[PDB]
Amino acid sequence: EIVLTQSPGTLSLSPGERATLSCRASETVSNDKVAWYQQKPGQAPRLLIYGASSRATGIPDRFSGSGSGTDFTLSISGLEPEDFVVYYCQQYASSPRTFGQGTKVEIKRTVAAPSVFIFPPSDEQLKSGTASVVCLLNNFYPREAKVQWKVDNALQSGNSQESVTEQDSKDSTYSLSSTLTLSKADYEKHKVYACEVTHQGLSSPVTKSFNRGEC
Amino acid sequence: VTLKESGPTLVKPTQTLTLTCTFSGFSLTTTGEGVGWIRQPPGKALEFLAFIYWNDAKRYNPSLQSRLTITKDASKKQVVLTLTNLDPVDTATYYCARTSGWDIEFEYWGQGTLVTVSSGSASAPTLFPLVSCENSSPSSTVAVGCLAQDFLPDSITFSWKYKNNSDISSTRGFPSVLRGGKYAATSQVLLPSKDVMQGTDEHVVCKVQHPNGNKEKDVPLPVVI
Numbered sequence: 252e253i254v255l256t257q258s259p260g261t262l263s264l265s266p267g268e269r270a271t272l273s274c275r276a277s278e279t280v281s282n283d284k285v286a287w288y289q290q291k292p293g294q295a296p297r298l299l300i301y302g303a304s305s306r307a308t309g310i311p312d313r314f315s316g317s318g319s320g321t322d323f324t325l326s327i328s329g330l331e332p333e334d335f336v337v338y339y340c341q342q343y344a345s346s347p348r349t350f351g352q353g354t355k356v357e358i359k360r361t362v363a364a365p366s367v368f369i370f371p372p373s374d375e376q377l378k379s380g381t382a383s384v385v386c387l388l389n390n391f392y393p394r395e396a397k398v399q400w401k402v403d404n405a406l407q408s409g410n411s412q413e414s415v416t417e418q419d420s421k422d423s424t425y426s427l428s429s430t431l432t433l434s435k436a437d438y439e440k441h442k443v444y445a446c447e448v449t450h451q452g453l454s455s456p457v458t459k460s461f462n463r464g465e466c
Numbered sequence: 467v468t469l470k471e472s473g474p475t476l477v478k479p480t481q482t483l484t485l486t487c488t489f490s491g492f493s494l495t496t497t498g499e500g501v502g503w504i505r506q507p508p509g510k511a512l513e514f515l516a517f518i519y520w521n522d523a524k525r526y527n528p529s530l531q532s533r534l535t536i537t538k539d540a541s542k543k544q545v546v547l548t549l550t551n552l553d554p555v556d557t558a559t560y561y562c563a564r565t566s567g568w569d570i571e572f573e574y575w576g577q578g579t580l581v582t583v584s585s586g587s588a589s590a591p592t593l594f595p596l597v598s599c600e601n602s603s604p605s606s607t608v609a610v611g612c613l614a615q616d617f618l619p620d621s622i623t624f625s626w627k628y629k630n631n632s633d634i635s636s637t638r639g640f641p642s643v644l645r646g647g648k649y650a651a652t653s654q655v656l657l658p659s660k661d662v663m664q665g666t667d668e669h670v671v672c673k674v675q676h677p678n679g680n681k682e683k684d685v686p687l688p689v690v691i
């Protein structure tokens with residue numbers, strides 16, 4: 252059992268610069284049989300370098316591998332927009348083999364203030380016994396953001412899954428949606444529902460709320 | 467060299483799951499060549515299930531030992547995978563690859579297939595209108611959304627049209643999340659505030675193309691004026 256840990260999880264790079272990916276192994280690998288893979292969301296993963304030193308057919312020469320033992324580094328010269336995908340390091344000397352957590356590289360951009368909108372549940376949806384309150388964040392950077400639900404001054408926990416979209420191809424921004432799920436009886440026992448959004452580019456937190464019966 | 471996967475798109479928990487990896491253009495006769503299965507749950511990394519070498523040599527993962535079986539049929543040139551004790555947390559997309567030697571591992575990858583493990587049934591999606599309750603802050607533009615809920619499997623495309631059947635460029639697609647055995651997703655669209663206080667069109671239609679029904683509900687604008 253060889254445990255592979257990759258760090259950092261997310262890194263912000265710029266096109267044309269150099270990116271270094273680190274791969275940590277829990278023990279030495281015989282014959283340095285470590286390979287790197289490239290995977291794009293939607294499509295299938297593709298092999299780039301096998302044995303950490305030999306490239307494969309149809310792979311550009313700008314990808315270079317180095318290191319041995321328990322330390323391996325992947326250096327890429329001439330970063331391209333299409334290269335902002337997730338990369339995994341894997342060793343095939345274990346039998347059975349193991350895979351790492353993987354690292355994601357994002358395009359570095361300036362901080363943009365997010366937009367917060369909240370939609371109260373519809374009357375038709377209330378008839379089904381389920382109430383859904385949404386909290387939408389759009390055009391923010393970096394991806395790291397805290398979304399907390401506060402209703403009747405009581406902080407909620409254990410009831411938010413959280414969905415986040417991928418990086419925009421033309422805007423390089425991120426968006427995420429937060430959905431609040433509660434019982435119909437509990438919904439009628441609360442008046443004001445608000446979600447708090449905290450951002451690096453905001454001096455003070457911005458809170459949005461609505462009054463039941465007015466929407 | 468190419469690979470193709472096939473199997474059921476919906477399987478109930480605690481049952482038998484069977485997948486077939488269809489490959490053509492090579493034979494598993496030379497040494498070093500082998501076939502392996504790699505799965506990846508959404509939002510997680512790749513997971514190694516098992517690998518089979520030549521001369522009927524098979525390898526299994528100790529974390530999943532005594533739970534998977536590897537069988538090969540040279541006549542049909544396709545490996546058969548059997549999965550038992552299905553669990554909702556094990557839902558992932560399964561891929562198979564060919565190793566062209568001892569050092570070149572997984573040189574060619576196929577396309578894969580989504581195998582959803584949910585106790586529920588493939589019911590038609592349900593749409594719910596969303597009214598914008600924003601006030602005292604018109605901001606740049608106003609936003610209206612569409613909550614597609616109770617759909618399985620996750621395959622939905624969103625398109626926004628006006629009352630006169632026009633075209634809108636939203637491109638705001640949120641991924642689905644497994645909540646209570648069902649997938650939930652949200653979609654929004656940005657519209658200028660000037661158009662709201664102008665044309666008599668007070669609502670727009672939300673359209674979803676899912677292979678369980680062609681319903682399309684309309685979301686009324688809150689109107690500011």
Ligand SMILES: *[C@@H]1O[C@H](CO)[C@@H](O[C@@H]2O[C@H](CO)[C@@H](O)[C@H](O)[C@H]2NC(C)=O)[C@H](O)[C@H]1NC(C)=O
Nearest residue numbers: 628629630631632633658660661662664665667
């Ligand atoms: C359908 O109605 C909308 C009104 O909401 C029309 O949009 C207006 O018309 C121009 C020209 O097409 C658009 O570019 C603008 O978005 C709207 N005008 C203004 C001043 O904002 C839309 O054109 C109509 N569809 C068709 C096919 O005519």
